[PDB]
Amino acid sequence: AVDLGNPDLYTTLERHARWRELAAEDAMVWSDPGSSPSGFWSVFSHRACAAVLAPSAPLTSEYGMMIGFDRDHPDNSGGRMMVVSEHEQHRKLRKLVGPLLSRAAARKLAERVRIEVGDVLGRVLDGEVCDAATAIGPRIPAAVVCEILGVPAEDEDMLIDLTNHAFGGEDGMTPRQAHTEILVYFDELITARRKEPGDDLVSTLVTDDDLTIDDVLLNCDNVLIGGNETTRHAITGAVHALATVPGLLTALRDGSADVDTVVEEVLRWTSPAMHVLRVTTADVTINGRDLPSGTPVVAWLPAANRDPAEFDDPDTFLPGRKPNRHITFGHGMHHCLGSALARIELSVVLRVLAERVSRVDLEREPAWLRAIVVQGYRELPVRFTGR
Numbered sequence: 339a340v341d342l343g344n345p346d347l348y349t350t351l352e353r354h355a356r357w358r359e360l361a362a363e364d365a366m367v368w369s370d371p372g373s374s375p376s377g378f379w380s381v382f383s384h385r386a387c388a389a390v391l392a393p394s395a396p397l398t399s400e401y402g403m404m405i406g407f408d409r410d411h412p413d414n415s416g417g418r419m420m421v422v423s424e425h426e427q428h429r430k431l432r433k434l435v436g437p438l439l440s441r442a443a444a445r446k447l448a449e450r451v452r453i454e455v456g457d458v459l460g461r462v463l464d465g466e467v468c469d470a471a472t473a474i475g476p477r478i479p480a481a482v483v484c485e486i487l488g489v490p491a492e493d494e495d496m497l498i499d500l501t502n503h504a505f506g507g508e509d510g511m512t513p514r515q516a517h518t519e520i521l522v523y524f525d526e527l528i529t530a531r532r533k534e535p536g537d538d539l540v541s542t543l544v545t546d547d548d549l550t551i552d553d554v555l556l557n558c559d560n561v562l563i564g565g566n567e568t569t570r571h572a573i574t575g576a577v578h579a580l581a582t583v584p585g586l587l588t589a590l591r592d593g594s595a596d597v598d599t600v601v602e603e604v605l606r607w608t609s610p611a612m613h614v615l616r617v618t619t620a621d622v623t624i625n626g627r628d629l630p631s632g633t634p635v636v637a638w639l640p641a642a643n644r645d646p647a648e649f650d651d652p653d654t655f656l657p658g659r660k661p662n663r664h665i666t667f668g669h670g671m672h673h674c675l676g677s678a679l680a681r682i683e684l685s686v687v688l689r690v691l692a693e694r695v696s697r698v699d700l701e702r703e704p705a706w707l708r709a710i711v712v713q714g715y716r717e718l719p720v721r722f723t724g725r
């Protein structure tokens with residue numbers, strides 16, 4: 339019996355070896371029920387994952403987009419939250435949230451990323467020692483999401499800390515409790531923005547009278563989860579790359595390496611979103627297997643981002659890797675709405691660390707989170723030297 343939803347398979351970097359085998363073969367593997375309530379098929383190659391997530395492909399996210407959910411066991415947020423909705427409800431929310439996460443919105447948030455990195459490099463610029471998976475990685479995305487939601491500056495530090503714990507190590511607050519506390523604050527913020535609307539995500543969501551208080555809350559949560567759960571590990575990955583890849587930090591400083599090109603390589607290299615699930619809407623043949631309607635199909639994104647048919651020497655971090663057609667942000671109609679924001683966050687992080695820090699050195703091997711939703715760092719012990 340095979341179960342690819344087992345988190346123990348991905349606790350070590352050997353997950354890449356398992357993925358490499360399945361990606362090069364372009365395999366369709368069936369997983370038996372266990373972590374999944376009904377089981378699921380899986381694709382691994384770049385071409386197979388792109389075909390599953392295609393706009394014209396008869397698959398849906400309305401029942402959920404992660405292992406644990408299917409047609410018979412649907413996501414409770416299904417049809418209400420953007421990432422688990424389809425058709426006009428999905429199009430509406432993507433239209434309402436869209437411009438607040440656009441390239442233009444990302445550019446005005448670039449200053450905050452610089453300030454937040456600078457404030458971090460005020461206590462870690464010492465010799466030893468700091469974890470990069472905490473108080474470095476989660477700090478930047480949390481600050482950005484705060485300004486998107488339009489939270490008062492007075493409450494930012496409270497919200498940063500709760501966001502940090504909500505998507506970090508599972509084990510006196512619990513990540514689930516911290517998540518709840520944010521949603522409790524969200525409800526209080528929703529109430530205040532009903533009386534006095536401004537220029538923020540909460541205000542934009544509440545002005546639409548067709549959306550209920552539950553719809554506003556769930557889509558605020560989509561931005562909270564979306565902007566934090568994955569992004570933190572990409573930032574930690576950027577620090578990890580600067581610590582391991584020789585000459586990279588210097589190359590960014592002098593300008594021999596292109597900043598936007600390395601951002602795309604960090605994205606491909608880290609691939610924080612480990613999987614995306616889809617449910618078939620009609621009878622379809624994927625790869626070479628005939629699947630009925632209501633069948634769960636899963637695309638393993640880090641496997642696709644290291645597919646040798648698409649990426650030459652995929653295990654090496656290449657600062658000038660071109661072309662780089664990674665699907666770290668997924669593909670098709672649900673392509674990450676905050677992709678420009680994720681790119682601007684990484685861009686500024688790599689810039690400021692090249693400007694202020696002379697050398698970043700790794701203390702010991704990183705630990706990984708016991709999870710399947712995210713390819714995440716549990717810890718990254720590093721030494722910072724600058725000034």
Ligand code: HEM
Nearest residue numbers: 403420421564565568569611614667668672674675676680
């Ligand atoms: C490098 C970090 C990030 C990664 C790896 C990532 C990954 C993804 C992926 C793979 C999806 C598609 C899910 C699916 O296909 O079912 C997605 C959707 C989404 N993400 Fe991101 N994301 C990142 C950063 C962000 C940021 C910064 C934001 C904004 C604050 C954000 C907000 C969203 C939203 C709102 C959706 C739903 C889009 C839709 O359903 O149309 N994400 N993300």
